[PDB]
Structure 1
Amino acid sequence: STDISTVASPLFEGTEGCFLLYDASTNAEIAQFNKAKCATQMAPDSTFKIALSLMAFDAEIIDQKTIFKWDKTPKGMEIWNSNHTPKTWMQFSVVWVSQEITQKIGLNKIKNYLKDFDYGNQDFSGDERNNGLTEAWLESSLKISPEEQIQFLRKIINHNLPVKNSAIENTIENMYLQDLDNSTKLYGKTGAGFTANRTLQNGWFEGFIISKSGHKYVFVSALTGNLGSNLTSSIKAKKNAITILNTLNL
């Protein structure tokens, strides 16, 4: 695992950052930054939509033609106040869609999926408000580390999970974002939130990259730090990931 601190350190200055890049098929570490932070678990926040998408498609509760209907009540973010699809649900981190999905699947089935995915601490208890089904993955009980997310991403693209193959590929397709400088394809998902009872912000940007040659890799960019009252932790994590990926020219 080539240490890329020389390029990553300036990008993460002012925060506790981490970056990991692994080969999809062999699990060989290609590049890393601040392994200590990489082993620390924290709320997955919206990156949990990757797992929820797998569950929703596998359970056959949604398909690519599904249209989630807005209930006309303000959700807190204007882009959330409209109808969505499985694709835009991921793109805009539409929490209310996730909540409709968890309610349909049920707590028991979610717990079973968490074991299948070996998802971090697998704690979906939430906060005594019994709000697990609606917020367990949002700066709540559920926690997972960047290292653990890497392995989860590997199992997905390698099809080493007990779920429909189509559930996996439909989820990956819905994560497509853009092509990098050298044409490498980028598929990813952001996640962000404020640490409970503190001012700190946590941020994630993780996913897959497919080189023009066809070689596949998985990556995770994460950080925790004081970035003010505006949630920009995932914007920063994503920007840093793209900068690093283009520099590595993989």
Structure 2
Amino acid sequence: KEWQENKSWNAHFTEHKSQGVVVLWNENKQQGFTNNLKRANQAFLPASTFKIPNSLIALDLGVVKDEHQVFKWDGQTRDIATWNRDHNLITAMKYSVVPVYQEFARQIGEARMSKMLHAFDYGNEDISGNVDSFWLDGGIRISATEQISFLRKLYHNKLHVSERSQRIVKQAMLTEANGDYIIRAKTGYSTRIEPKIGWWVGWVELDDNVWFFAMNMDMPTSDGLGLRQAITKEVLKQEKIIP
């Protein structure tokens, strides 16, 4: 069976008075697992999870030379302290620095952004809205299961951008690593259009397997943003993927 429903994972959403989906993909067995088959396939705004494809396109088109190139703060004080400074690809991803990516998007342009999302088979491939905000309040929509399809192509260097572009983005996605596993992931928080949801998408590298993952959850306030990672990890722990 391609996809199996495991409703016992809802205990982890319930424990934190939350609602959402975790989708796992066992790369070795080519098998999916989720607590909610329906919500697993419900398409939402990608929000900052879009920084993954945006990074790839920017690198491939030379908008970003490498992970060292500095993007100068424009001097507009914004409400996230960490955005109010110079950034490179690594720090811009780490802190989800929208202004840097809005600038990448303007330089990429509508026509090339569109051609690339088509080549990537990314979500509904719809960039309608502002070229510099469409992943936050435009037409683009992607499900947890479609995030995993895209992430598996990135992991195997199968997107039509250079191997180099893919390696650099995967470096930039690095989030956590220890003796037990490596997580390459990107967070997202969609707030501009209802419903407000938190994202975490990426994968867990083990010695002998890769577990791809995409979770989203109802996020009325930013007070629960920490539950994106904490709930994903309770699921990974239950499934014995991490100790």
Per the TM superposition, whether the score is higher than 0.5 is: yes
| 1:216 maps to 2:210 | yes
Relative distance call for 1:120 and 1:234 in structure 2 (3 A) is farther
Relative distance call for 1:24 and 1:52 in structure 2 (3 A) is farther
Deviation per CA, 1:144-203: give whole Å up to 9, x if none: 1111111011111112211101111111111111136x611111110012262x5x4211
Q: Which secondary structure does the structure 1 equivalent of 2:228 belong to? A: helix
Q: CA deviation at 1:122?
A: 1.5
Aligned to 1:185: 182
Q: Which runs of 5+ in 2 are unaligned?
A: none
| 1:93 maps to 2:99 | no
- Matching of residues 1-250 of structure 1 within 5 Å: 1-6=3-8, 8-13=9-14, 14-24=17-27, 27-29=30-32, 31-62=33-64, 63-126=66-129, 132-179=130-177, 183-194=180-191, 196=193, 198=194, 200-211=195-206, 213-224=207-218, 227=220, 230-232=221-223, 234-250=225-241
Q: CA deviation at 1:246?
A: 2.8
Q: CA deviation at 1:2?
A: 5.0
Q: Is the 8 A contact 1:201 1:231 kept in 2?
A: no
Q: CA deviation at 1:57?
A: 1.3
Q: Which runs of 5+ in 1 are unaligned?
A: 127-131
In 2, the alpha carbon distance for the partners of 1:51 and 1:26 equals 26
In 2, the alpha carbon distance for the partners of 1:245 and 1:120 equals 25
Relative distance call for 1:109 and 1:39 in structure 2 (3 A) is same
In 2, the alpha carbon distance for the partners of 1:144 and 1:2 equals 20
Relative distance call for 1:25 and 1:152 in structure 2 (3 A) is farther
TM-score of the pair, normalised by structure 1: 0.87
In 2, the alpha carbon distance for the partners of 1:68 and 1:190 equals 21
Q: CA deviation at 1:25?
A: 5.9
- The alignment yields a C-alpha RMSD, in angstroms, of 1.9
Q: Is the 8 A contact 1:24 1:157 kept in 2?
A: no
Q: CA deviation at 1:121?
A: 1.4
Q: CA deviation at 1:233?
A: 5.3
